[PDB]
């Protein structure tokens, strides 16, 4: 078939984009050939070939992730060239994986430092804009979680401060885009000096 007309990309969300076309004139049309790729990984390609229609959403992408695009029509009289390419970029998305590598050390008898390292890159899914510590008490009197949030992006550690003394906390640490908190670390366990 002929090449494709008025190929068209809108984003819907962090992992969806709609694809869209026009339905080509006086052609027996059997299937298109749509071919994307990330932009910062041009070598690795994926094809999806779909019966005849003007639209198709693309899912499960990465997000905040620029993609190209290119369609193909396969008619009667085989497959015709390839558009231009198209791109649009995924919307961000909060954090897939927690912070790494949580240690604890007392520095006190009411001083906690806690640090970590950012997700693995690959579940970040976008930038990442700050970082939030959550304790909370083992034993004794106050056995609520505290969250302290607003933590910049360039901490690697942070001093939980005004703890009870010769305390048992749990500790998690979170982070956060743009679009929200992702999922907090496994609790690392300390307890205060005295
Ligand atoms: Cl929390």
Same mark, same amino acid.
């Given at each position: 078939?002929?090449?494709? =007309?008025?190929?068209?990309?809108?984003?819907?969300?962090?992992?969806? #984009?709609?694809?869209?076309?026009?339905? @080509?004139?006086?052609?027996? #049309? #059997?299937?298109?050939?749509?071919?994307?790729?990330?932009? %910062?990984?041009?070598?690795?390609?994926?094809?999806?070939?779909?019966?005849? /229609? $003007? +639209?198709?959403?693309?899912?499960?992408?990465?997000?905040?992730?620029?993609?190209?695009?290119?369609? =193909?029509?396969?008619?009667?009289?085989?497959?015709?060239?390839? /558009? @231009?390419?198209?791109?649009?970029?995924? =919307?961000? +998305?909060?954090?897939?994986?927690?912070?790494?590598?949580?240690?604890?050390?007392?520095?006190?008898?009411?001083?906690?430092?806690?640090?970590?390292? @950012?997700?693995?890159?690959? $579940?970040?899914?976008?930038? #990442?804009?700050?970082?939030?510590?959550?304790?909370?008490?083992?034993?004794?009197?106050?056995?609520?979680?505290?969250?302290?949030?607003?933590?910049?992006? %360039?901490? +690697?550690?942070?001093?939980?401060?005004?703890?009870?003394?010769?305390?048992?906390?749990?500790?998690?640490?979170?982070?956060?885009?743009?679009?929200?908190?992702?999922?907090?670390?496994?609790?690392?366990?300390?307890?205060?000096?005295?």
């Amino acid at each position: 078939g002929a090449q494709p =007309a008025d190929f068209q990309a809108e984003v819907e969300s962090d992992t969806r #984009i709609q694809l869209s076309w026009l339905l @080509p004139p006086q052609e027996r #049309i #059997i299937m298109y050939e749509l071919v994307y790729w990330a932009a %910062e990984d041009e070598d690795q390609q994926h094809k999806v070939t779909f019966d005849p /229609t $003007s +639209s198709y959403t693309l899912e499960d992408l990465k997000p905040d992730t620029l993609y190209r695009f290119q369609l =193909a029509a396969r008619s009667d009289m085989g497959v015709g060239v390839f /558009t @231009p390419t198209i791109e649009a970029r995924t =919307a961000q +998305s909060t954090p897939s994986a927690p912070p790494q590598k949580v240690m604890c050390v007392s520095m006190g008898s009411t001083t906690v430092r806690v640090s970590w390292v @950012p997700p693995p890159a690959d $579940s970040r899914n976008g930038v #990442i804009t700050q970082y939030s510590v959550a304790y909370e008490a083992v034993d004794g009197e106050d056995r609520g979680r505290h969250v302290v949030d607003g933590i910049s992006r %360039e901490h +690697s550690s942070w001093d939980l401060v005004g703890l009870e003394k010769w305390t048992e906390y749990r500790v998690w640490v979170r982070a956060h885009t743009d679009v929200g908190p992702g999922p907090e670390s496994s609790p690392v366990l300390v307890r205060t000096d005295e």
